[model samples]
Target chain A: VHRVWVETAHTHGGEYLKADLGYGEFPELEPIAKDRLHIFSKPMQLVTEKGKENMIQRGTYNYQYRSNRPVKDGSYLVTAEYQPTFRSKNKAGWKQAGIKEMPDASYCEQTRMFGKNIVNVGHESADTAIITKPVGQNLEIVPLDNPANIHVGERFKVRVLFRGEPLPNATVTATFDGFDTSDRSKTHKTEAQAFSDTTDGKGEVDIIPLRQGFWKASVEYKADFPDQSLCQKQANYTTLTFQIG
Target chain B: VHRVWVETAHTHGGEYLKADLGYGEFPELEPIAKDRLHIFSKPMQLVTEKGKENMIQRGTYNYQYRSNRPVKDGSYLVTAEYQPTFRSKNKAGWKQAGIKEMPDASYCEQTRMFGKNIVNVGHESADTAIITKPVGQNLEIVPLDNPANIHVGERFKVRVLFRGEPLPNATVTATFDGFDTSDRSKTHKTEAQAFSDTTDGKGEVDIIPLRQGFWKASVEYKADFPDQSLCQKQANYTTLTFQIG
Candidate 1:
């Protein structure tokens, strides 16, 4: 005996049809009659960039088989997932916005899938991680004690301290704002000059000036290291201002 | 043969005239050349705080002398070192100008004639001793890091590292350039937001944004305990731009 049946379904804007056939009739084949009699039909289309539209047609239907099978098997159940395709008017492959390459291992056997794979499928995500170096604590600089009013051409020394201690070998530089010459047209000279020296293990930099004026001294120090990245921690700048007659 | 010779010379506007009498002639006299005379002089003047002149003479002076010999004395050589009075217009005294004060012993002495009494001779000098305490160091505010860019509504985290470590429990205030709104705008209801945590052992601060535009975040972290005497270190203003959709 032979039997034939057709199943028609409409979803969204797409329509699908399934044809089934049965062989010799048997009383004990109730499970097969209800589940597996799929015969021949227009298989679900698998669209590729190569203008390839492949479909499945006929074979012995095995529902429990699990293998890395291709979609061309006649007995296989094919399901098509569609994304909007763009025709470039010149290019052969469909063009879409923001879509790059297709994913690897598009589908998996329902039984073999477990854990997060069920929810995420084959997707990956990312984040930013920042690693900061350890910085010094309580770095400081202080000016030296000297006569409030110093005479011009007099040599006075100013000291720079780091963390309450004299920083030897530290280089200090200074500049004055109020002493800037008003007229750029004429030759101008500054009474101020700066010097750099290292502290004697006490973290002090003694700065001496050459001229007399209101001067603000700025100092900077850095530790010596092979890698520039590691030495950045030792960098610091400070300023001290004083007046000379 | 007992003879008393009284000779006086004016030194430096008569400030040291009386003290000069006992110097050359009395060589072997003990008590006679000891404390027989008292020298008085005007105090040095300090002019500070425009139009204000303060004189040291206004302060009181006391003197005493003891001779280690009996009344029967011979010719003795005596010398007196007299210094003018010292004054300061400010509380810092002579230290404001970094000058050392003269010792109390640097005064003058007087001697008498052998077997002759009733001769009142005096010498004076104008050597002044002004002592002062050193001035305290000035407070310094240094920028730790450059400012950053940010957008409106998007949250941004800035870490202010002092010397290189995160500074926790520090108060940071932020301001904007283009937008009228600020962290401490009483009119706009947005004030500078402070971080709850200090730079965790590292001098770092995490900053977030409420409104977007161009903003510069300036962080002022005050040191704790003994460091309170120092000024707060202001991190460099980080300018960030943000757009709101």
Candidate 2:
């Protein structure tokens, strides 16, 4: 799908946190225009025990938003918020947005997409207070545990929240970077046997990451638009990105 | 092969030049030990029309070495030098070192490897003077043209030098990042039909990068060790890394 997600969940010695706006599959980076990309990131604030303050400077260029300042040797919480205006989509882009198209129905969709990714800077005593806590996006995914501690083949729970309330029965699909290099698949494709699940009564879905790398988990909700004349469907898409060790 | 090559040939926005000492295929990123790694990089010196001065700070951590300072807006000639000590290799490491394995011969090899990668910052009028010029690598691969200007499916020439002298008939193999995701291949695998060539009398080999991205070209030379008691053969390996637009 056309996704705005963090490029690399973990940055090494001299690298800074970076996020991208692109289409197709992960790691098959097809960059979108800067004007069409409405993604922004909160500064990776350093957290010592229970302290918090901005430590990284944020800026946007090309199709990416990244930290402009030097990253110190301390734990920091990295988070990104992507909110793009409703776009006019035809059949292809409509289906790519995770909205089903009926055989005889007109295929104009007003797709409003929002993405969030919580990345931690340091591995040693990384701050988890903010990562597990919701930043309060209209539709957000809050990890029940710190992502840095999540390992491969281990189950983790993510609570989907819509308007500060649990979003139950929401279908959540996940994919890892370099999972499929082919860009033909635009939707958030997943291995059915590995990860095809829905949120429970508490809006929590158990995910067992099969690999150790950056992964993108996305959920889409569709309904009739407020004004039927504007579009046939109003699809709200949100994706959460994190790293599994 | 256990190579020490620049990781990403191009760094965008807040990223800095990074090099890695790893085993297996590209993008598979199997990191080596810091103690076994002996790679260093000259600062990405900025050049305006014709100028040179250090603009990036170099430091090493884990299995990689990268710039520890902020990168500016102007064009730069980024170069790295890797001079690891001779490694004691058994049959497997010996074969990975690109040396012919003789059956029934007690297999032991003393391998000395060197790597160079010329990367550029600021695509707008990126300085080509230093990028094309040899930085005096013992077994260096000097690109005849600026790598920043090279494109996919375009032919580029590189000269091989040993001890400041032309080294003719050197066998060169190339690969790009993410070319093979499997880490089992410990050799510098190549698409023979696409890229298997040797240097001419003038020590120049023509290369046609089939795909755009980070391309790594490597060459190897083997001979009897000065002291055969130490090892069966002495092998010298060098790799050049560059980006094709």
Number of the predicted model whose lDDT against the real structure is largest: 2
Task: Give per-residue lDDT, candidate 1, residue A220.
Answer: 48
| Per-residue accuracy of model 1 over A1-245 as CA lDDT, tens digit each | 22111111111111222212112111111123442233322233322222224344333552111112232211111121111111112233332221233333322111000000000011121111100110111223333334233454243454445444455545444433332223332322122222223343444433344345545554444432224332212233343334444
lDDT (Cα, tens digit) per residue for candidate 2, span B1-245: 45545554456645665545433344455545455444433333332235444444334535454555545544444434444345555442220112433434455666666655665666664555666666666677887887766776556788988757778767666666644333354233322112445676688866766567777787777755656566566667777777778
Please state the CAPRI-style docking class of candidate 1. incorrect
lDDT of 1 by residue, B106-181 (tens): 3221211111001011222111111011111011112222112224322344444433334443433433333232
Candidate 1 residue-wise lDDT at B104: 31
lDDT of candidate 2 vs native? 0.57
* TM-score, model 1 to reference: 0.18
DockQ of all candidates, in order? 0.01, 0.01
Total clashing pairs for each candidate? 74, 2
